[PDB]
């Protein structure tokens, strides 16, 4: 039963050679070993440091794949060197071997997921209906069920934050917290518009219809916009008010103006008579105005997302659920599972694992 | 205190609660010290006057329950952060009158 598990360590390791490109990185590795090889290469060591750190960046690829074809091959000869001599220690000592290379290959599979800043934060899934309407709101509810059963069959927590059910039948939108480990790595390769070509049940004479719904996926940040006001950067002017007051207002510097230096935000207050009532008030107004800019930043980045976020429309898609000839196709890598109502059960691993290249 | 506590090896501190012990003894019979083996103490274990091996003619004058030595966790900068961001509930005033 053991040589079936070498059969698989050679399977994930070959298309691991595909996106890593041993063929395109055994090449680049050589003229960095050539540039750094002539004695003048520590001439502007910025040039040098990037390449010696590159060199193991490519020798964790080239030479790690070089210990997978030699290593597995000295595993499969030692486990036949234990069957035909009845030597059971040559087969515990060629299995302690298969537990070591099952990690150098596990480590090399975290070039799929260890490359995305924060691919570990408890991410959120933002599903939306789309073209079509009732049909697509049905398909939207189908697709939340799909990712819920997915997340349960993967150790995530199925945590639903916000729903809104559609008025005919189904869901217009949903947001789930996929509270789990490394959750963003898996579900970010699920971002896209899921077309569902399908056969439709809401159309009277039973016509074949297309309806789309999207899945957008993001991680979790600090979401704290409470910047502290530090006196290193506030310049506070004091001067006289401009209206009524008497020998006062004239003869007293009651008005204050606080200007945040790096921003250029200015603020005044003249409302009361004490400069400290006014210095108080202008500190408030100055707090709130930098609370409104840091607001304007965040919304600005959000609108940058929204306007760069597809449209859930015709020809904007990634999948077929042609349930009238039983396929589900991911036009992007692209695979073709034929066991359709097994995908809705949560076999997304298929597409995901191959889509992380 | 003979021996180096194993808690000390783990980074702890030997707090010497008593550096001497109260005792009834003859003037002809005064010992110079009394040894105590603290090498077995972790963080945070403790020794008591009951654990004292006493020499002949000397007789413990405090309660055997009296603690003599303890090994305590060290001072650590990794904690400062939590202690700085630790918020304190403002002091409650004990009620008086129709407020008890």
């Amino acid at each position: 039963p053991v040589n079936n598990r070498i059969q698989d360590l050679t399977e994930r390791s070959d298309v691991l050679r595909g996106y890593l490109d041993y063929d395109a990185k055994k090449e680049r590795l050589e003229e960095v070993n050539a540039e750094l090889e002539q004695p003048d290469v520590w001439n502007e060591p910025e040039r040098a440091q990037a390449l010696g750190k590159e060199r193991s960046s490519l020798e964790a690829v080239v030479d790690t794949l070089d210990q997978m074809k030699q290593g597995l091959e000295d595993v499969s000869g030692l486990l036949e060197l234990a069957v035909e001599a009845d030597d059971e220690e040559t087969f515990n000592e060629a299995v302690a071997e298969l537990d070591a290379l099952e990690e150098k290959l596990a480590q090399l599979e975290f070039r799929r997921m260890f490359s995305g800043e924060y691919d570990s934060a408890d991410c959120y899934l933002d599903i939306q209906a789309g073209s079509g309407g009732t049909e697509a709101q049905d398909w939207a509810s189908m697709l939340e069920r799909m990712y819920l059963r997915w997340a349960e069959s993967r150790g995530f927590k199925t945590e639903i934050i916000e729903e809104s059910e559609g008025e005919v039948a189904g869901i217009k939108s949903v947001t789930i917290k996929i509270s789990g480990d490394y959750a963003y790595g898996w579900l970010r390769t699920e971002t896209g518009v899921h077309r569902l070509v399908r056969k439709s049940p809401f159309d009277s004479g039973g016509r074949r219809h297309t309806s789309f719904s999207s899945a957008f996926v993001y991680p979790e940040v600090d979401d704290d916009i409470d910047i502290e006001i530090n006196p290193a950067d506030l310049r506070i002017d004091v001067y006289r008010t401009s209206g009524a007051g008497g020998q006062h207002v004239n003869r007293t510097e009651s008005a204050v103006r606080i200007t945040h230096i790096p921003t250029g935000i200015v603020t005044q207050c003249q409302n009361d008579r004490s400069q400290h009532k006014n210095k108080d008030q202008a500190m408030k107004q100055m707090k709130a105005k930098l609370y409104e800019l840091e607001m304007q930043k965040k919304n600005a980045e959000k609108q940058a997302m929204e306007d760069n976020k597809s449209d859930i429309g015709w020809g904007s898609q990634i999948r077929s659920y042609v349930l009238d000839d039983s396929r589900i196709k991911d036009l992007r890598t692209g695979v073709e599972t034929r066991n359709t109502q097994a995908v809705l059960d949560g076999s997304l691993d298929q597409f995901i694992e191959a889509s992380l290249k | 205190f003979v021996g180096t506590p194993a808690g000390v090896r783990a980074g702890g501190v030997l707090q010497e609660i008593h550096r001497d012990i109260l005792v009834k003894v003859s003037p002809r019979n005064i010992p110079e010290f009394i040894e105590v083996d603290v090498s077995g103490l972790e963080i945070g274990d403790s020794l008591h006057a009951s654990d004292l091996k006493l020499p002949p003619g000397v007789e413990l004058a405090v309660s055997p329950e009296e603690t003599i030595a303890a090994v305590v966790p060290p001072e650590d900068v990794e904690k400062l952060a939590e202690e700085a961001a630790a918020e304190v509930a403002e002091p409650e005033v004990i009620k008086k009158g129709k407020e008890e």
Partner: protein, 141 residues
């Protein structure tokens, strides 16, 4: 930082700083101690700054004992009100310290470490201080 968890009274008259310490004048726990040479109200701020200075010098190891504690509420009226209209608001708390008191006390630490840490802690305090180590005079108390 340090303050009473609860109290019978919120506010407290100022009193006065006459004489040497009532007690706590001898090293009672650690190996060395920082003794006050002149009287003052030591704020909880100052105590905490001294403590953090010492643990931040020890980095890891040692044991600090703080033997003063601010139970005396400090009061101040809101800025630019006039005299009268009641006693000010509680703004912080202080520990009453008089000449001769062992304020801080360190153990589990070499002599140069204790000397240096207690010195730096002394710079965080509003009074002149003096570094002492445990004596037979201390033990006899």
């Amino acid at each position: 930082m340090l303050m009473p968890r609860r109290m019978k009274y919120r506010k407290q008259q100022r009193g006065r700083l006459k004489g040497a310490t009532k007690g706590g004048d001898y090293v009672a726990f650690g190996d060395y101690g920082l003794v006050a040479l002149e009287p003052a109200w030591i704020t909880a701020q100052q105590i905490e700054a001294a403590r953090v200075a010492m643990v931040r010098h020890f980095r890891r190891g040692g044991k600090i004992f703080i033997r003063i504690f601010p139970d005396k509420p400090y009061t101040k009226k809101p800025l630019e009100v006039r005299m009268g209209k009641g006693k000010g608001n509680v703004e912080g708390y202080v520990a009453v310290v008089k000449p001769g008191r062992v304020m801080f006390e360190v153990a589990g630490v070499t002599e140069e470490q204790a000397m240096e840490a207690l010195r730096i802690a002394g710079h965080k305090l509003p009074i002149k201080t003096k570094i002492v180590r445990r004596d037979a005079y201390d033990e006899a108390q």
